[PDB]
C-alpha cells in the first residue's frame, strides 16, 4: 500500500509485465495439469487413474494428439511440441519476476511511472475532465497523508485535521 | 492531448524494426 500511494506501482509497465508472468504462470500451471489429467490414456482398470503410471515406462501417459485437437478447436491454437511447452512454462513466470525487479530498481531512485503528463495538463486546465487515472491519484494522495505520520514516525509529521485531504462527509 | 510527438516515431520504430527482423529471418527460412 505504501507502494501504491507513494510510487503508483500499479501503473508501472514493469510490474504489469510481472503481473502477466505470475498470473500467466498460474494459468499455464493449471491448464497443463488439467489437460494431462483429462487426456490420460486408459492404462489400468480402476477409477483411480493414479495407479496406471510406472515412472520407468517408455510411453507418454497422455495423448499429445488429442490434447492438441481439443485446444486447436476450443481456443484456435494449441501446443504441439512437448519441449517448447515445458520450456515456455519456465520462461513465462521467470521472465515476469525479472521484469518486476527492474521496476523496483527504478523505484529505488523514486524513478516512478507516476503520472501521465498529457492527462495532468488537461486535468489542470479542464475541471470536467476525469478519468480513472485522476481518480486513482486522489486515492494515492489519501494514502500518503493519512498513513505517513505513523508510518514514518522519525519525520515528526504533524498534519492538523484541516490539511488532511478528504471528500465530502467521509 | 499534449502528448510527446516523439512518441509516435518511437512507437513506430519499436514495432517496425524488430518485426522486420523476424520477417526477414522467416522468409529466408521458407525459401531453403
Amino acid at each position: 500500500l505504501f507502494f501504491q500511494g507513494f510510487h503508483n506501482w500499479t501503473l508501472n509497465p514493469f510490474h504489469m509485465m510481472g503481473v502477466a508472468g505470475v498470473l500467466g504462470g498460474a494459468l499455464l500451471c493449471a491448464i497443463h495439469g488439467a489437460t494431462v489429467e483429462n487426456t490420460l490414456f486408459q492404462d489400468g482398470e480402476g477409477a483411480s487413474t493414479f495407479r496406471a503410471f510406472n515412472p520407468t515406462q517408455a510411453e507418454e501417459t497422455y495423448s499429445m494428439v488429442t490434447a492438441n485437437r481439443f485446444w486447436s478447436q476450443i481456443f484456435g491454437i494449441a501446443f504441439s511440441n512437448k519441449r517448447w511447452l515445458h520450456f515456455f512454462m519456465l520462461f513465462v513466470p521467470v521472465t515476469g519476476l525479472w521484469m518486476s525487479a527492474i521496476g523496483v530498481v527504478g523505484l529505488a531512485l523514486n524513478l516512478r511511472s507516476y503520472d501521465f503528463i498529457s492527462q495532468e495538463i488537461r486535468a489542470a486546465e479542464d475541471p470536467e475532465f476525469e478519468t480513472f487515472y485522476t481518480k486513482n491519484l486522489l486515492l494515492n494522495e489519501g494514502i500518503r497523508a493519512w498513513m505517513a505520520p505513523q508510518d514514518q514516525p522519525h519525520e515528526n509529521f504533524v498534519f492538523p485535521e484541516e490539511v488532511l485531504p478528504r471528500g465530502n462527509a467521509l | 492531448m499534449e502528448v510527446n510527438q516523439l512518441g509516435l516515431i518511437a512507437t513506430a520504430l519499436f514495432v517496425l524494426v524488430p518485426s522486420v527482423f523476424l520477417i526477414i529471418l522467416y522468409v529466408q527460412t521458407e525459401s531453403q
Binding site: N68, I77, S80 | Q5, G7, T11, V15
Partner: peptide
C-alpha cells in the same frame, strides 16, 4: 495521432490472431 496509433496496433494483433489460427503450421504426426 495517439488514438490512431493505439487502434492500429490493436488491429494488427487481431489480424495476427487470424493468421495464427487459420494459417498456422499444421501439426502433423511423424
Amino acid at each position: 495521432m495517439e488514438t490512431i496509433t493505439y487502434v492500429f496496433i490493436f488491429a494488427c494483433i487481431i489480424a495476427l490472431f487470424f493468421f495464427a489460427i487459420f494459417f498456422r503450421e499444421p501439426p502433423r504426426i511423424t
